[PDB]
């Protein structure tokens, strides 16, 4: 529902889960090109 | 290892799009596009440790760890997408999927939309094959995106900064699980993670094999 | 359990858990629904349950008004929670006298608000002069697994019924091409007694 | 997630003591008796 989209944006924008940048991914993961 | 495929099942297409009519002229904006054309011009796939993405997908019974451990492990892929959101906004939001199977299965395609690793909506389609050039092909063409997705995309474009769009997409994932009805075996499983493409670029992606080293 | 209209019927709806102990499978049924001869069903005024389901556009009231009104049902379930809590799932079977494409939407509601949704599409197979739709071993969402484990671990049995007071499931079966409502089942729950299996009652919903 | 299930349980149980009950609504007697 619309309310669930809004719930997601509130939690995500509220700046217990490591950021993706702090996890082990190869350098291609951060390069769109 | 060069494509989202096993020895007996492959992804032929996955396209997320929106159709826009303006001044009696139709055009289709591609948010995400994965092809499946198989040739020597395809680089070998990099690998990603699946333990790094467990908290972004459903857990417990039937979750990603359980499905991966049940296997086959070579059916598991992670796609990192740069969704193209460089579009103004009557519009139709759709998805087109296409698959090829060596065996004539009844293909059960489950798609789970997740927010902070939790399912919001799961769409399950149980498709039958069509013989196209002696191949079993399955197509779910211009299938409507659910209202949640439409609202999500519309709200992402309201963000004044691209860093806010990326923080919001960091916890937005989609999990695709393709199964054969008769055996209930996993034929293919694709996890999707997202970032927003640059304003001067269209959609791009990288495909990774999920390993548990 | 014959939940049937002039054209569509639910033949089976089984929510269950499966465990493999010593290389042998064991199944426990939480809920089980499912003859051409039955007594008349009891009726229930749909207005008594509106507040337990979403009330916006496309909600239970809007769906009932659009009809057909012979397709609305209320199922009262006594869920069997007596088991040692691996797969959690639902197996269901449906029958039609017309080969439409079935689209089954199931929503889980907490205090009349949608928490999670599942939309499943199925094609029929003609079998013994009826079209059959099967949805075998559909995996339960994590929310429901979490909900069931938390419910059975409540320290007092009355608490299980208090938590179920505002927990509902709404199923809307539709024919894909026409969007016709084939069947709509509203589900409400209580926990079965310790020494008992799962039981249920079925009510026709009417605008009383 | 566990937190979403927890929010429903917390609101329903109301441990800290922070609409008609189903028991007082118009349902046939069979609605309250499993048998
Ligand atoms: C909470 C105890 C009573 C309810 C237990 C059985 C409910 C029926 C199955 C619900 C499945 C919803 C859809 C899904 O999770 O995929």
Residue numbers in the entry:
A (entry chain C): 298 to 312, 320 to 337
B (entry chain A): 222 to 310, 317 to 440
C (entry chain B): 223 to 256, 260 to 310, 318 to 440
D (entry chain D): 298 to 315, 321 to 337
Sentences from the paper on this structure:
The superimposition of the structure of the Vg:Sd complex on that of the YAP:TEAD and VGLL1:TEAD complexes show that the α-helix of the Sd/TEAD-binding site of these three co-factors bind to a similar location at the surface of Sd/TEAD. The three conserved residues in the VxxHF motif from the TONDU domain of VGLL1 and Vg occupy the same position and His305Vg forms the same two hydrogen bonds with Sd (with Ser342Sd and Val395Sd) as His44VGLL1 does with TEAD in the VGLL1:TEAD complex. The structure of the Vg:Sd complex shows that the Sd-binding domain of Vg indeed contains an Ω-loop, which binds to Sd in a similar fashion than the Ω-loop of YAP binding to TEAD. The linker region connecting the α-helix and the Ω-loop of Vg is not completely resolved in our structure probably because of its flexibility. The three hydrophobic residues Met324Vg:Phe329Vg:Phe333Vg present in the Ω-loop of Vg occupy the same position at the binding interface as Met86YAP:Leu91YAP:Phe95YAP do. In the Vg:Sd complex, Trp334Vg is at the position of Phe96YAP but it does not engage in a π-cation interaction because Ser325Vg replaces Arg87YAP. The key salt bridge between Arg89YAP and Asp272TEAD4 found in the YAP:TEAD complex is also observed between Arg327Vg and Asp276Sd in the Vg:Sd complex. Finally, Ser332Vg is within hydrogen bond distance of Glu267Sd:Tyr435Sd, as is the case for Ser94YAP and Glu263TEAD4:Tyr409TEAD4 in the YAP:TEAD complex.
The TEAD-binding domain of YAP is formed of a β-strand:α-helix:Ω-loop motif while the TEAD-binding domain of VGLL1 contains only a β-strand:α-helix motif, known as TONDU domain, which binds to TEAD in a fashion similar to the β-strand:α-helix region of YAP. In the larval wing primordium, the wing imaginal disc, Vg-Sd interaction plays a major role in the specification of the wing cell fate; the deletion of Vg leads to a complete loss of the wing pouch and subsequently the adult wing. We demonstrate that Vg from D. melanogaster has an Ω-loop that is required for tight binding to Sd and our in vivo assays show that in some ectopic assays (such as the transformation of the eye to wing-like structures), full function of the Vg protein requires the Ω-loop.
